[PDB]
Amino acid sequence: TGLLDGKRILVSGIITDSSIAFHIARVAQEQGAQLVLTGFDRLRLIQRITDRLPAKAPLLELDVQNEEHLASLAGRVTEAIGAGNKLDGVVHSIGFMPQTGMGINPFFDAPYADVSKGIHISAYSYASMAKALLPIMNPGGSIVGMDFDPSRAMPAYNWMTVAKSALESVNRFVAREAGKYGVRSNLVAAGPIRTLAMSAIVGGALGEEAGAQIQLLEEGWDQRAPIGWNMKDATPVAKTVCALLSDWLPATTGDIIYADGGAHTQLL
Amino acid sequence: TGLLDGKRILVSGIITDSSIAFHIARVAQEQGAQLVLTGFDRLRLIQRITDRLPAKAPLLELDVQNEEHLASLAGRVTEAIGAGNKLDGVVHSIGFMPQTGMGINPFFDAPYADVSKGIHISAYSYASMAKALLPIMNPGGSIVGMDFDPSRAMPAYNWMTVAKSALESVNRFVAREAGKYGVRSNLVAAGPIRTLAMSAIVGGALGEEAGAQIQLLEEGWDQRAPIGWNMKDATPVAKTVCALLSDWLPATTGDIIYADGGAHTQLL
Amino acid sequence: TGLLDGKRILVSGIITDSSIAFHIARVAQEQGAQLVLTGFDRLRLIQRITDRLPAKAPLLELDVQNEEHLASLAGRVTEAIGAGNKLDGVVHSIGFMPQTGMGINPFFDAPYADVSKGIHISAYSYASMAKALLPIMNPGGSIVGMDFDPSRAMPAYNWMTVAKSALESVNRFVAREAGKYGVRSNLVAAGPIRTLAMSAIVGGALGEEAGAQIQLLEEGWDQRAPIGWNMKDATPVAKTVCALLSDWLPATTGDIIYADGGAHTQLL
Amino acid sequence: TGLLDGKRILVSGIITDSSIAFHIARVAQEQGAQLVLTGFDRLRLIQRITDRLPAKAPLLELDVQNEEHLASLAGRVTEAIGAGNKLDGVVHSIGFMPQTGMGINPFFDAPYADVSKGIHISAYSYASMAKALLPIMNPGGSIVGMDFDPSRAMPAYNWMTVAKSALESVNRFVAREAGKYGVRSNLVAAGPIRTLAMSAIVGGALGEEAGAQIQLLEEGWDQRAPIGWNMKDATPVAKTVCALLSDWLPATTGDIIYADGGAHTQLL
Ligand SMILES: NC(=O)c1ccc[n+]([C@@H]2O[C@H](COP(=O)([O-])OP(=O)(O)OC[C@H]3O[C@@H](n4cnc5c(N)ncnc54)[C@H](O)[C@@H]3O)[C@@H](O)[C@H]2O)c1
Ligand SMILES: NC(=O)c1ccc[n+]([C@@H]2O[C@H](COP(=O)([O-])OP(=O)(O)OC[C@H]3O[C@@H](n4cnc5c(N)ncnc54)[C@H](O)[C@@H]3O)[C@@H](O)[C@H]2O)c1
Ligand SMILES: NC(=O)c1ccc[n+]([C@@H]2O[C@H](COP(=O)([O-])OP(=O)(O)OC[C@H]3O[C@@H](n4cnc5c(N)ncnc54)[C@H](O)[C@@H]3O)[C@@H](O)[C@H]2O)c1
Numbered sequence A, B, C, D: 001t002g003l004l005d006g007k008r009i010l011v012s013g014i015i016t017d018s019s020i021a022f023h024i025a026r027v028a029q030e031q032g033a034q035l036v037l038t039g040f041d042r043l044r045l046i047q048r049i050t051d052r053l054p055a056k057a058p059l060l061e062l063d064v065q066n067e068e069h070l071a072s073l074a075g076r077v078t079e080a081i082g083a084g085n086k087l088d089g090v091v092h093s094i095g096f097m098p099q100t101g102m103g104i105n106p107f108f109d110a111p112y113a114d115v116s117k118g119i120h121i122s123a124y125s126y127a128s129m130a131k132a133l134l135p136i137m138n139p140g141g142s143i144v145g146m147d148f149d150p151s152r153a154m155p156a157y158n159w160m161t162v163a164k165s166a167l168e169s170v171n172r173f174v175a176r177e178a179g180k181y182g183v184r185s186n187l188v189a190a191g192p193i194r195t196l197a198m199s200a201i202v203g204g205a206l207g208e209e210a211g212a213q214i215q216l217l218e219e220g221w222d223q224r225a226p227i228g229w230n231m232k233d234a235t236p237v238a239k240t241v242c243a244l245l246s247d248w249l250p251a252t253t254g255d256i257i258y259a260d261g262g263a264h265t266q267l268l
């Protein structure tokens, strides 16, 4: 009798055991969902990581920049979940920006080829994935993507911020298409989570000033959040994604749900 | 094994069987919640209405303009749910504006005494109720109020719009206080629902032009909503309130969740 | 050949030589405007203060809570500017909240009578003044009010924040009415300005914690602002108000212009 | 004694006599500005068009996708305005999206190469131009770009909406860089203007449904606007751009000014 009982859900974006998508997948399985996973490039690694999930889940390769992967995706999913079965949920937990577009590298010095790759993977692919999967989604279904509130500029996030602004806009158009299928489309705007890469950035991977700025941001986030914010714990974010995958937010689409401790509602 | 199993939840705002709060109460009981109800003025009526709910629930009198009712409320609730027990949830589903502040009556002609009464009941009372009940709420608890998106002006809603703008602001401050108790505070911004009064307004109760404008608004709402909007069905709104009352949005506070078909995310 | 040449403009809100409205009045006169001033309660004081303005300007009494003052206001203005002449501009620079609604006094402990007085003076009066003056305003005219961005909660501002949220909503409805006269209505959302009272609050007038919080807010504001923010200098705010009073923002109404150094566009 | 007396301003984006940038250039010259113009591809045409401006202005070639044009731009501008002189203003009035990304062509069918070209020209180039020109801008200067409010999805605008969402985000980062030079960066969000291309789209150039939808949008815009909206008249938009180029909005940056009749502040 889990929140997601009987639901078939595709989860993208796992690359380490600290990936937000790993925690989404775990909580969804704890709540009764049957998963299909998609992974990029390092499939041996991803299989070994996802062996630790509560239940077995087929892993499919998906490079969202690869037109062939996208064209075959729905057939490969149907194969994995069985003919006559469709998906009830899709989780997009995919993002990337070349180093030139983040950190201490000057904003103006990011070449457009780099920015374009970042926007391709982080924003356009939300539409790509919806295009591929809506034909095999059930009415009442739910597409969820991960967001980091880009309403205001900030240090170091630079062109990734721009990519998230694009993603929010893409989400509102995907909602128009998804609606034709009886499917919702929404983003979860999460507070900062210490994934491997984030600890790497805080450790100086993209410049000392960038690391210092991110630590300041994390500290301010917990301070502003009326219920606090634990950057080491993705479970509250995973639960929020599962809420959107469930039947309990049936009139919300094209929208953004903030799983950020309430920080964005407070100035100081 | 309901969404709200084991939870003790106070629901205000029932006055007819079409009240949004009636549907909130029904769905919460279907999902395992144990309720306490509060009602204003017509308690015989409200008891008879709430006899139709799936389970029994104590009814307490609460006029939010009455300082004595508010001062005694927590003790009366504790009496009803038993010493040593606290609330896990509170639903504010209360609103009012004198006729001078809505409909075809000119915006400039509403006397401040009338506007002030409207803001008292519709906005300040969200803080009043939180003040009264937070001392008897459990960590992990949830306070939810009902909103109608006031971000833009519109015909006829007039000073009630202003009251909702005030309420949204109040909610962000209540979140600061509630956080000290481990409690969340949020609003659900619902699309238009045909309560008794709304059918009365559409029927011309506050002027012909106002009724005509509201019908146009309802029609445009369903058109804009990517998944449509059924003004005759409060259940999607009730489900959204229950989602916020649950454990599945644990990192959302001071915030607004839109149960409006996605209409506010679309221009046309 | 000033920005406001030939324009007749009413300016409310002067009480000291540090009032934002004093600087609005000064800059408007430097730019060729002919002013009428309104003052509350201490008219001897206000006359002596406004003697320092670049040019003479009639002072009229206006308590916005006084129905008689409002009913006579248009006639008294016409008397001062001469029959057959109308106003081109109106500046609302009026705000008040009792001490119970601000500072370290708990948010929940503000009595509604106090909150209501604050909302009356700070929000409803924007509509009151528009109602009184639109009948004596020229097409192409402009009504401007002062705002402090209430989109997010913050320490100490408490119920004044709620009042500003109400004011923003009121402004969008006043724009609907003003449009019938060919008149615009907008707010200027200013950064923090060290008026007498603010220095008093920073000095602890409403509690030590409140003063400490406001200093932190001021410091963060200048840090966030990409062009910086000087809380001791109201002239940039006054210039912005004059821009809205001019003919150079002819397609902006119901809106908010931010004269805040850009701080609200930046997270950190 | 014009609004922009003595100011040296670069204006991009003229391609016909109906271009918003043509009207910006005309009004800026009427107000005393000395201009430098930039044009894309059809320089004979653009010269012949700009011969009709009130005063002479040097025309320089600038394809914002051309790295060489951008690298040489500042030197070519300095040549045109004379060594030792710098710019006080820059107007970005540049936008493009391939047909696959707009109109009746399905949202999901736009190839990323097309979307990327659109985002390059419509969003990234705002940063490109700022990078090129900030080194030759005076303190107190102003960079202004043109926006179409992308906060909500709408029919037909499709990926251009996404490009504008990206542009708004870019603007907030350009403000951070520009601030180092004492320069402001802002967008003007205009209502719909009947440029040549728009009349072409309304005439069905991108599909009948798209044309029908745009006409509906135009009609609704004028209806919602409290002061109305004339899609045939760019002058109110041009005046707003000149307001931002002036000294009268000195504390506004990273921001968006709406020259849209107030339509975005009203639901209906
Ligand atoms: N970590 C945070 O603080 C934070 C906050 C808010 C939102 N988010 C978002 O959450 C999502 C997941 O990020 P994360 O922090 O868990 O990091 P992560 O590195 O664990 O996940 C990013 C994922 O994107 C995948 N990816 C990259 N290029 C791809 C491609 N071509 N095709 C398919 N997949 C590709 C990576 O393989 C990886 O699995 C991203 O959208 C991120 O922007 C993260
Ligand atoms: N109906 C809609 O279209 C709609 C849309 C969005 C939000 N809402 C909001 O939902 C809430 C419930 O409204 P509804 O449409 O169900 O109407 P309703 O008339 O059924 O409920 C309003 C309730 O407020 C109560 N109330 C009034 N004065 C009170 C007082 N002094 N003390 C205590 N309670 C008092 C009434 O008794 C009634 O139960 C309100 O906040 C309303 O603004 C309604
Ligand atoms: N100081 C800031 O940091 C700041 C920032 C943003 C906006 N504002 C706003 O600017 C406006 C002016 O504030 P200020 O900081 O210049 O302070 P101020 O004290 O100089 O001005 C407030 C004015 O309101 C007047 N007022 C109060 N009650 C009145 C009544 N009953 N009738 C008529 N007038 C009445 C006072 O007499 C005074 O002139 C207010 O709306 C304020 O909220 C101030």
Ligand SMILES: NC(=O)c1ccc[n+]([C@@H]2O[C@H](COP(=O)([O-])OP(=O)(O)OC[C@H]3O[C@@H](n4cnc5c(N)ncnc54)[C@H](O)[C@@H]3O)[C@@H](O)[C@H]2O)c1
Binding pocket: D012, D013, D014, D015, D016, D018, D019, D020, D021, D039, D040, D062, D063, D064, D065, D092, D093, D094, D095, D096, D121, D146, D147, D148, D189, D190, D191, D192, D193, D194, D195, D197, D198
């Ligand atoms: N027309 C409207 O309804 C409307 C509304 C709001 C905002 N806007 C914006 O106003 C701006 C001007 O648009 P317009 O309506 O005047 O149309 P327009 O066609 O007259 O102007 C667009 C300009 O972009 C230029 N451009 C395209 N590719 C370029 C490149 N590679 N390098 C340099 N310049 C390039 C074109 O040559 C043209 O001068 C655009 O940003 C547009 O999005 C237009």
Ligand SMILES: O=C(Nc1ccccc1)[C@H]1CC(=O)N(C2CCCCC2)C1
Binding pocket: A095, A096, A097, A103, A148, A154, A155, A156, A157, A158, A160, A192, A197, A198, A201, A214, A217
């Ligand atoms: O990078 C991240 N946060 C952050 C905040 C401020 C300044 C710099 C960085 C987080 C948020 C986010 O989208 N991430 C992505 C970045 C791209 C690769 C995958 C993870 C990680």
Ligand SMILES: O=C(Nc1ccccc1)[C@H]1CC(=O)N(C2CCCCC2)C1
Binding pocket: B095, B096, B097, B103, B148, B154, B155, B156, B157, B158, B160, B192, B197, B198, B201, B214, B217
């Ligand atoms: O009044 C309502 N909708 C509406 C929309 C546009 C114009 C006029 C009216 C709905 C939304 C709302 O808060 N309601 C309240 C009004 C006050 C008494 C209780 C119900 C009913």
Ligand SMILES: O=C(Nc1ccccc1)[C@H]1CC(=O)N(C2CCCCC2)C1
Binding pocket: C095, C096, C097, C103, C148, C154, C155, C156, C157, C158, C160, C192, C197, C198, C201, C214, C217
């Ligand atoms: O009070 C003010 N700022 C502030 C910010 C954070 C916390 C506490 C106070 C400023 C802004 C404002 O509206 N003011 C008004 C308050 C009421 C009387 C007139 C001046 C002064």
Ligand SMILES: O=C(Nc1ccccc1)[C@H]1CC(=O)N(C2CCCCC2)C1
Binding pocket: D095, D096, D097, D103, D148, D154, D155, D156, D157, D158, D160, D192, D197, D198, D201, D214, D217
């Ligand atoms: O295309 C435009 N408006 C519009 C609105 C709704 C649906 C479809 C179109 C306007 C706004 C805009 O950015 N334009 C640009 C588009 C790209 C080339 C230059 C002009 C023209």
